[PDB]
Ligand binder design. Sequence first.
Ligand SMILES: Nc1ncnc2c1ncn2[C@@H]1O[C@H](COP(=O)(O)OP(=O)(O)OP(=O)(O)O)[C@@H](O)[C@H]1O
Ligand SMILES: [Ca+2]
Ligand SMILES: [Ca+2]
Length: 362
Amino acid sequence: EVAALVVDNGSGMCKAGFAGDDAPRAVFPSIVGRPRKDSYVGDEAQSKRGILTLKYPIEHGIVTNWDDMEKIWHHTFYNELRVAPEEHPVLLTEAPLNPKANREKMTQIMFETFNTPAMYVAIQAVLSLYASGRTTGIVLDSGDGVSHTVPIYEGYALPHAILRLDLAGRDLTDYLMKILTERGYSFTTTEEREIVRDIKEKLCYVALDFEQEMATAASSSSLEKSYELKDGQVITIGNERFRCPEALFQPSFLGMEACGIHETTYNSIMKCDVDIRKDLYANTVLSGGTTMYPGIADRMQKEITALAPSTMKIKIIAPPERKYSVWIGGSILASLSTFQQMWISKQEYDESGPSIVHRKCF
Ligand SMILES: Nc1ncnc2c1ncn2[C@@H]1O[C@H](COP(=O)(O)OP(=O)(O)OP(=O)(O)O)[C@@H](O)[C@H]1O
Ligand SMILES: [Ca+2]
Ligand SMILES: [Ca+2]
């Protein structure tokens, strides 16, 4: 048969490729822009922020604007991948607990706007579990605009226990800007957010112990690293390195009341049947770009261990490529001989309409 396409749309980044590959073929920004061609998507839209009025179709993980998304998909198919959708089964990914209505429009749009011969909508968190080699376990997926702790058992996500923490890599990028500014630098523009995001990605890490790290940085220079601007200037970053991602465990640094990611994972586990919690503790999988900070795994271990019973075996799984675990899970799933029957065919759609996405998905 032909090649299945795996499209993973995020709040900040869109990843797309072909099932069978172990990495997406294309990855671009999830922003669209129209004058203030006729529309612009990705980097090209970002380089005209001035002349175009930009939009962000995916917000906190949920498609907020459809014609915007329809355009991102058009971009994916014809520009990035260069394939005719009507010639490839497409596998989409959606955020946990995304409304039943969005699920139907995704289906409807794929069959009536792009003429896909088949398609399927899968839950992101679950695709990551599949990618780690498990069917049972709790996932902490943290992207650029939203975090979710998702308990899964025997391949099914547990809807009543899924939690949402609106604190991801974006908040972290702005926070790093704020603290480097207070430090004496000045990072406030959109072009600079782009620079600080890179800083955050190459120099930041999670301290095993906040205070001790802070104490070493106040009395020593050992934790400092240098970063060079395209313009040539070298700037140093010390405690901002760990102080930035610490906001994941302590949202109050950002004036947020929500509890940390470690505590949110623990709260999701407890909303579960006491008979499967051990399976979750021993199978806590880290997913998403925000979970890439050096030292986050050891930290999560220590924080969970302290929140859970002393007789509890805790194990944090952090795949080296978790930045794309979601997409790889879709590449892995759409390849399975047993998943071929899950696809929603054009035929199945015509006869049963959009409401069939609940019957074949989920
Ligand atoms: N090495 C890294 N260290 C820390 N953060 C990183 C790293 N690499 C990428 N990120 C951050 O990961 C975020 C993007 O991750 P991802 O693409 O998984 O999320 P998304 O799908 O775009 O959005 P979301 O899943 O929350 O709706 C960005 O904030 C990016 O800066
Ligand atoms: Ca995502
Ligand atoms: Ca707090």
